[PDB]
Design a protein around this ligand. Sequence first.
Ligand SMILES: OC[C@@H]1[C@@H](O[C@@H]2O[C@H](CO)[C@@H](O)[C@H](O)[C@H]2O)[C@H](O)[C@@H](O)c2nccn21
Length: 358
Amino acid sequence: SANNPWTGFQIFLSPYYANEVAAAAKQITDPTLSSKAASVANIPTFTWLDSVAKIPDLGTYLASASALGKSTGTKQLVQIVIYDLPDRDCAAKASNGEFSIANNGQANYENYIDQIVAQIQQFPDVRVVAVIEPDSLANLVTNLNVQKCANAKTTYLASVNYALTNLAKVGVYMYMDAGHAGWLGWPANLSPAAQLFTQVWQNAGKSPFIKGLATNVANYNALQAASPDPITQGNPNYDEIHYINALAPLLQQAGWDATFIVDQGRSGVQNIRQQWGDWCNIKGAGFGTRPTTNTGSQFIDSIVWVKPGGESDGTSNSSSPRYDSTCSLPDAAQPAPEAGTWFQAYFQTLVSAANPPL
Ligand SMILES: OC[C@@H]1[C@@H](O[C@@H]2O[C@H](CO)[C@@H](O)[C@H](O)[C@H]2O)[C@H](O)[C@@H](O)c2nccn21
């Protein structure tokens, strides 16, 4: 499209990830691996607003970015993830969150959005790009036989709509989560997905700040695979570029010339899964292609790092109420801590296995 949100801006580096990375690096014993690990803090990532507790820090990021831009002659861009739906993670347990549909969840979510909007409104000289609710709308394509997802459908749609409609009022550039090639990229899922995303876009008023979709968030697929990963058998869309090439024209035909961003933060190492659905702390992953607007596709505004490598996908402790057995598979690194918390050995492997090398 004409307007790529990243062009003309410097990305504000996540202080949250920088603090995790600095602490992680100083414990890595080899001087060279440690210096490579420390350098990860200079790679732009998305910072997740996975609870109301993260909102005050958003305010600090915006104010720090504003001052950094003034100090360096630049316009700054802050990258955030909106990730606090009620009944969050309807198809599994590892990422269940603080709000529930049964306890005023939609209303609580509105207030979460209102607090975020109130921060963003105070810093108009900082641009914000937001990924909207990973692992939400994609469940309403394929997972409606999951009763928790079926019962969450109206709330997910209403809450995502509230986020889109009200973040647009403060000029936030938005990419809605859209799963990955092995989820919505199956040919038969493309049209239902396009129909849903178009309905969501319509309900939110077709705002131009709603730029498009984010794919591969927290996943491990290639953008452009050298050869199909054997987990992809049966699906001609074996990587993210095939998925996006197939979905984007459907959105165009439906009236929305959407563009895309693609997570590659844990995509450096391919062919490390037994089943494509495997997702939890996949063993041996490496940091992938660095964020860039040189994407190789008309449809893709940026390669990005959305899931911050080193933060766990889920606990492997079967006593936890957030335990998903996907996290004890032979392709899951174990033992692993609760989703979102730091997993030091996994981070060190991501550094060691980075491709391209750090
Ligand atoms: O992608 C959204 C979440 C994600 O955890 C989420 O990661 C975020 C970034 O580290 C954290 O802020 C969250 O606390 C955590 O729940 C998992 O990494 C992924 O495997 C998954 N599967 C279902 C939900 N989720």
